[PDB]
Ligand binder design. Sequence first.
Ligand SMILES: Nc1ncnc2c1ncn2[C@@H]1O[C@H](COP(=O)(O)OP(=O)(O)OC[C@H]2O[C@@H](O)[C@H](O)[C@@H]2O)[C@@H](O)[C@H]1O
Length: 267
Amino acid sequence: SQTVDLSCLSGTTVRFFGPSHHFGGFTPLYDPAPDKRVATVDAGANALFIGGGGLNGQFAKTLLEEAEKHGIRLTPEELSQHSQRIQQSLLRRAVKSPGKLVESPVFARSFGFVPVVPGLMWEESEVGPNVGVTFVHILKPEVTPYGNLNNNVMMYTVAPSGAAPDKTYSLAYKTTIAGVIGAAAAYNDTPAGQQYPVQGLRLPLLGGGIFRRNRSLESIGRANAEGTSLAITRYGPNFELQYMYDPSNAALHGLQEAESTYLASAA
Ligand SMILES: Nc1ncnc2c1ncn2[C@@H]1O[C@H](COP(=O)(O)OP(=O)(O)OC[C@H]2O[C@@H](O)[C@H](O)[C@@H]2O)[C@@H](O)[C@H]1O
């Protein structure tokens, strides 16, 4: 990988992952011997379950394998239903106190956050249900990857559908990223976060797989760059960002373009 500090993100340290040893070169969700606590952000489903395909399926696989090792009987069906029930409950609570962080075989503690009520500032029919909601979970020791205490936090976010018009998509995407950064920043100011502070985020290109439909990866990369810059302005460059490997390099390209633009802003 390569790590650089980006001025367009207020000096934030960003780690861009290259291809891994694994099939398809995908970046692992968690490392065996991390020297800091990095929370990986699940590209969640609108229905709020952990399961399915893509990145969400890898979160499911990771939790299930660890449960199996510890003799915990937990099927993919049980994990999907349970995670959905928990996150549905958090969404209900979060929508009743919007803009506030609200607070099991797998979860020790769970948090929810919506920057704004979904569907209130955009069309649900255009971007999709529950867009912008973010959850933070502390994992129980028994399902923590590698039994390492620095791997005990995950996040879960719902991205907008790429089919949406550009104006509403940009708004929805900026809001989603604000929810990710905001939820983590708020988490670190809770009692739970004092004990287990998040020191980095490991990010996919949110909305960039099955959700993007006909939308170009480059437009999403631009949305991510703008959203990330604004979110860091709002909440501060508290922790480092890591972008998981993407052969399109969409997130990288967006930030490169933003960085060069930032250099020229006073000329
Ligand atoms: N097995 C994997 N391991 C690591 N990274 C992956 C994997 N599969 C996909 N990715 C990367 O994660 C990024 C996120 O893509 P998606 O997971 O498709 O996210 P999104 O398109 O927003 O939709 C997610 C949807 O897929 C389902 O798994 C889940 O139920 C959710 O509804 C993609 O850019 C892709 O490169």
